[PDB]
Amino acid sequence: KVFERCELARTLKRLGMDGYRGISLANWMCLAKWESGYNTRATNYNAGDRSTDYGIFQINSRYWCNDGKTPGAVNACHLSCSALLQDNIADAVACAKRVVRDPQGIRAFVAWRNRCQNRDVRQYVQGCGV
Numbered sequence: 001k002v003f004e005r006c007e008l009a010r011t012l013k014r015l016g017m018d019g020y021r022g023i024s025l026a027n028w029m030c031l032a033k034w035e036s037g038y039n040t041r042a043t044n045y046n047a048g049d050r051s052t053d054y055g056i057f058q059i060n061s062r063y064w065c066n067d068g069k070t071p072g073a074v075n076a077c078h079l080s081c082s083a084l085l086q087d088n089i090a091d092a093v094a095c096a097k098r099v100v101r102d103p104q105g106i107r108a109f110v111a112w113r114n115r116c117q118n119r120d121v122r123q124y125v126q127g128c129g130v
Contacts, residue, residue: 001087003038003056005029006128013130015093021100028096029124030116031109032056040087055084057096057109064095 035058036042051062061070065081077095
């Protein structure tokens with residue numbers, strides 16, 4: 001499913017993402033935008049280390065979810081990577097919350113460092129009623 005901007009913002013809000021571990025909803029929106037374009041079906045294979053990024057937040061199969069074909073997988077979210085390709089993002093959100101519980105927090109997602117950090121991110125939630 002490809003989310004409309006405000007539809008996604010309200011959805012993340014309901015799922016308890018606003019202010020989770022000090023991360024604002026606008027920051028989460030910026031992350032989703034640049035990781036997948038708000039597309040839950042997005043996948044990206046990393047030929048270098050043989051891992052794959054899954055879903056709206058492009059969560060990696062080496063550390064977070066299990067796809068059974070990634071060398072040295074850890075499955076920290078204790079989830080099948082399949083769960084990260086659903087239209088319903090509850091599982092993706094639960095896993096994203098797990099990711100940011102590590103020391104790095106939101107910094108764990110490189111895309112956030114490149115496109116969101118130290119930038120004006122209000123634009124992502126404006127007009128959404130969140």
